[model samples]
Target chain A: PMWVDFSDTASMKNLDPQGGFKVGTVFKKEISPGYVVTLTVTELKPFNSTEIYKKRVEGTPTANTYDPNAINSYLKGYKDYGKTPPSVTGRTQIILPDDAVNWGIKFKVEATYRGNPVKPSVVMADGEDANPAEYGIFTTNGEGWEYVGEWMKGPYTVMTEDMVKAFDKTRKDGLLILKDKSVDWSKYLSPDTVTGGLGSQVFGPIISAS
Target chain B: KAVPVVMTRGASEVGFYVATGGQQALMMGFLVV
Candidate 1:
């Protein structure tokens, strides 16, 4: 059974609206014992990308480092390193039963857009300068971590772009779900019971509405 | 592109002349209607 477990060592922070990276923050929760990880991502590419007409033809629609996937690949790595390690408190470390994960604790990770429709500069970060702003932010157990955005009221679905749009944002305790399974949950690393059925429940992301 | 012509208070005959020329242009296929 695949189980989705987060480092119980959580340090929830209120999202910063302006800056993309925090001087002394981390995007990913850090656990002393690093777990072997597999990753998953959704919306790696934009659907209806409007190809700009070149005035003086350079070449065919040559996808550049600016393209989504290039950035996505860049954003999928570990977080930055902090000056001093955060004081791990509360349920920062995850409690994994022996029956957890088909494999070991895997990072159920993916690349996402972190810029907002209104504000483009805002980005997501967990690891240190590991993630690039031109692409987006990511978290490993490191420094310069931050939240993506605020929690919505309820009964609302999260857009895949929201991840991208949340370039430099973070969330505390919120209930989020995939309405369409546009991204896969299976390939990502989860514990056994969770891989089978309780990861979302145990980790949280509840159903606020019906 | 079809263009519209404007004639205020000149001669009612202007309408016929303009229409005739416009029609001729369209028929000859030199101008698109």
Candidate 2:
């Protein structure tokens, strides 16, 4: 049981990069190389939800509960240890958990993209990653974040739901992603576009997908 | 290639933040414009 988790490099950095983000003489970076495929979504469970034990037994338990074994062990160690102090300060790593102030306490940070304890980063407000309106960047003239699709392809869509739907009344806001189960999202947000109150402690927005 | 080093309003580009909607204040990245 050496490092013991060498799940054979889980996703091993999704492999196919083949020198994508650069730094040639590339081969010098081995095992546990995962953190540049940018999954975005930055948190998109409000694509809608109604369950998670009905929002912790009646809404506001901080809606966001879809822990398929902690998102399948954070997508098998983030496809082989990829997410960690990266995202280059772009934000998305808030996983506040608290089973009624007991599930280990020390929770309440909001937002998530697959965090196990460390999350924080933001530095790209220049254009806020957008350039359409006749400036074009794909997705029919409008790119301030809104593609909402693709898992391993990197762009898990929803590039920007406007600071996450403008806080949706700020009840229990969260939207960090990197998850794939054949996404459907029932055509742009659902169930009254989220009214808050999630139990079973639900909060969509996971990643790794190993 | 990340030139552009301005500071003053919560200036810390790599301390740690993770989920900002309150305009980032975990390690600094604030703006009031």
Candidate 3:
């Protein structure tokens, strides 16, 4: 089916180096051969800090993290007689289950290590591998998202009267909680001191982790 | 018997030793940071 008829209207010009981004390479294999190891091209277009921030802030429903503003705005939809949460532009491809909605928690998005697209995520915090265990329903940072393990790690350790003080509120790589457990998990999203209400979320200046 | 351990982060160097005890000699560590 290879026909030369299209050559009549086809225009051919010599190629130029400035045409576009490209990588032509050569390689070998060990023991008489080698392999190609290029800098790598990915469909992933990296976003800048600001772009990443917005994506992190304005979350998809399935997003593991979301700001308080985003969540409350989403929550509004439910109160406004909508069956499902209203959608945010940046929240494409994310989801928040009804369980999180029922619990009134909206986790904020953590800036991904790489500027990758958000997808529905299942976070494994308490149990390391092959086992998932008790968790807080999704809760909001009122600015961004966090994993359930993070909040649980804190309050489970040091229960306190202060909303912020009720938990560790620090980033920990790993920890273990082995004991009879009890915590009033509701106060985190709606602390009396913090600004947390429908469509009203604020990002105060980064405060010290005291 | 040698209980080999590997350090992954901020690990410029590491040393391993094998010694005996009445029961067992558990490994211990310290964080410089």
Candidate 4:
């Protein structure tokens, strides 16, 4: 598995080598008075692609580093990585409760490598194509990792009490079925169980109206 | 390449995933729209 340390601090300070935040962990930040944004870890699935790629080129006399630039070139030559598809995938459910919904809350996903923020090579949403530049904070490699704005921004859904209750009715195994037709869950859902039955039916945890 | 950000921002909520270097991680939060 590609090990990751889940830090409580936004700067990712004081990390643990073997530590990882479990499913169901919740993070809350109050952006303003009477308005709290909640982020929950609904699922975590890690893969060994990174570890495997490293091992493949382990003894090669090159700049043995996992820097973004090096990795990009290495991946281009090695098409097998695409076939193997070693990557960690997880789900986070964000909720804007009560009055915060009126504020028109937007969410952004920021990534930091070695304590400095960096733009991801790819930014893909459920129903969208691979268009990182359009949604990302930085447009080109020249801007570099040091250039940081608000990162990629996406609008948040305002779910009322009735909407929550209506969605709750479709819960199965603590997960809820997504009502939005825009999202293509099949790409993310586990293929083994997807066609059999349960996979396509389960999306993520149910959202609380509070 | 490096970790790619795969996400699902639906009507009810947002879902995201990423591959990280040993020292890398992701943070998600709210901003004024």
lDDT of each model, Cα atoms only? 0.18, 0.20, 0.20, 0.25
lDDT of 1 by residue, A66-90 (tens): 2322111101111321222122111
Residues B1-33 of candidate 3: C-alpha lDDT, one tens digit per residue: 112211112221111111100001112121111
* Tens digit of per-residue lDDT, candidate 2, span A63-145: 34323223211221223333422112111112211110000001112112233222322222121221110010111011122
Chain A TM per prediction: 0.15, 0.18, 0.15, 0.21
- Cα deviation of A110 in candidate 3 (Å)? 14
Give each model's clash number.
45, 38, 30, 0
- Greater lDDT among 3 and 4 belongs to 4
Q: Candidate 2 at A159: error in angstroms?
A: 8.4
Fnat, one value per model:
0.00, 0.01, 0.00, 0.03
- Number of the top candidate by lDDT? 4
Off by over 4 Å in 4: A1-19, A46-210, B1-11, B19-24
TM-score of model number 2 = 0.18
Between candidates 2 and 3, which one is better according to DockQ? 2
Better-scoring candidate (TM-score), 1 or 4: 4
Q: What is the per-residue lDDT of model 4 for residues A1-210, given as tens digits with 9 covering 90 to 100?
A: 111222334523222232323344444443344444444444332211123223433465422532222221112222233332322222232211111000011222333344443332322222122211111111111111121122231222222334434434655432222232122222222222212111122221111111
Ranking by lDDT: 4, 2, 3, 1
> Worst 10-residue stretch by lDDT in candidate 4 chain A?
A96-105
Worst 10 residues of 2 chain B by lDDT: B8-17
RMSDs, each prediction? Answer: 30.5, 18.3, 23.8, 20.4
Tens digits of per-residue lDDT for model 3, A61-170: 32333222322111222233245432211110112222212111122121121233222122211111111111211111232322122211112221123423323233
Error of 2 at A122 (Å): 13
